Amino acid sequence: SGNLLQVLMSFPSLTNFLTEVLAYSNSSARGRAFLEHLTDLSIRGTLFVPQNSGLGENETLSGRDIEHHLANVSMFFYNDLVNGTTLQTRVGSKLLITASQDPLQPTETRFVDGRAILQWDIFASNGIIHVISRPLKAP
Secondary structure, three states: OOOHHHHHOOOHHHHHHHHHHHHHHOOOHHHHHHHHHHOOOOOOEEEEEEOOOOOOOOOOOOHHHHHOOEEOOOOOOHHHOOOOOEEEEOOOOEEEEEEEOOOOOOOOEEEEOOEEEEEEEEEEOOEEEEEEOOOOOOO
């Protein structure tokens, strides 16, 4: 499939974050540059996307919060992201992966800034998406 934006557009449960991204792009030059980055095939990124189960339509996010969902160095898959991994984001802050092994589970249970990961490793041509339980927050 397509770039990070196109893949985000392909999931009904991710429409509210998409709406925020698109509205941000039409709001400011910063917002437009963020959307252009998501569609740039010469970069790689890791985009954490809060699902509509934790983000409503009446919870307008700031541009800084939106951009903080993009770990902007490279694509980090499930099997790259161990306990204590810190990820630099586009706004200059850091996300923290925490992770332990419940021996019963088929995979490690992991969190990003304490948010549950609901789906790992959704591929895009210029990045990877992980769906999370609720939005991240820029400091």
